[PDB]
Design an enzyme around this catalytic site. Structure first.
Site, PDB file in Angstrom:
ATOM      1  N   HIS A  63      29.500 -12.345  51.812  1.00  0.00           N
ATOM      2  CA  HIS A  63      28.257 -12.043  51.107  1.00  0.00           C
ATOM      3  C   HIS A  63      28.472 -12.054  49.596  1.00  0.00           C
ATOM      4  CE1 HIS A  63      30.291  -8.093  51.756  1.00  0.00           C
ATOM      5  NE2 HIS A  63      30.689  -8.780  52.830  1.00  0.00           N
ATOM      6  N   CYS A  64      27.539 -12.668  48.878  1.00  0.00           N
ATOM      7  CA  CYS A  64      27.629 -12.741  47.424  1.00  0.00           C
ATOM      8  C   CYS A  64      26.476 -11.977  46.779  1.00  0.00           C
ATOM      9  CB  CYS A  64      27.594 -14.201  46.971  1.00  0.00           C
ATOM     10  SG  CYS A  64      27.323 -14.272  45.183  1.00  0.00           S
ATOM     11  N   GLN A  65      26.699 -11.492  45.562  1.00  0.00           N
ATOM     12  CA  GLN A  65      25.670 -10.744  44.849  1.00  0.00           C
ATOM     13  C   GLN A  65      24.280 -11.222  45.255  1.00  0.00           C
ATOM     14  OE1 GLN A  65      23.480 -11.948  41.950  1.00  0.00           O
ATOM     15  NE2 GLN A  65      24.034 -10.564  40.334  1.00  0.00           N
ATOM     16  N   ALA A  66      24.053 -12.527  45.138  1.00  0.00           N
ATOM     17  CA  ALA A  66      22.760 -13.101  45.494  1.00  0.00           C
ATOM     18  C   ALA A  66      22.942 -14.465  46.153  1.00  0.00           C
ATOM     19  CB  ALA A  66      21.896 -13.250  44.240  1.00  0.00           C
TER      20      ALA A  66
END
Length: 107
Positions: A63-66
């Site tokens: 998972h990435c910030q956005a």
């Protein structure tokens, strides 16, 4: 080559199973907000180092910030994660938060 997208609601059901959540972004962002239940490994760390996190389990999630770094490494993981079983966090943490779940900042 079998990564499937999931909703912050599913990744959770796994957090109870043992799933291995991994973050690939800037700790600076992970610090102000972190989920005491996932591994922290700056993309640049895997893209440059290459740590088969897949060997530390069977199922792994990224998972990435956005959903910005994941979409970039998403292709780099599927390869290092072999035909194993990998999922995808739609949006990233921004969802887990809106999903109605609290966050944890590094004190």
């Amino acid at each position: 080559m079998a990564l499937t997208t999931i909703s912050p609601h599913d990744a959770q059901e796994l957090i109870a199973r043992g799933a291995k959540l991994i973050d690939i972004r800037d700790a600076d962002e992970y610090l102000r907000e972190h989920i005491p239940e996932a591994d922290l490994a700056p993309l640049s760390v895997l893209e440059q180092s290459g740590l088969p996190a897949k060997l530390r389990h069977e199922q792994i999630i990224f998972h990435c910030q956005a959903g910005k770094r994941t979409s970039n490494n998403a292709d780099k993981l599927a390869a290092i994660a072999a035909p194993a079983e990998i999922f995808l966090l739609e949006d990233g943490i921004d969802g887990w938060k809106r999903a109605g779940l609290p966050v944890a900042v590094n004190k």
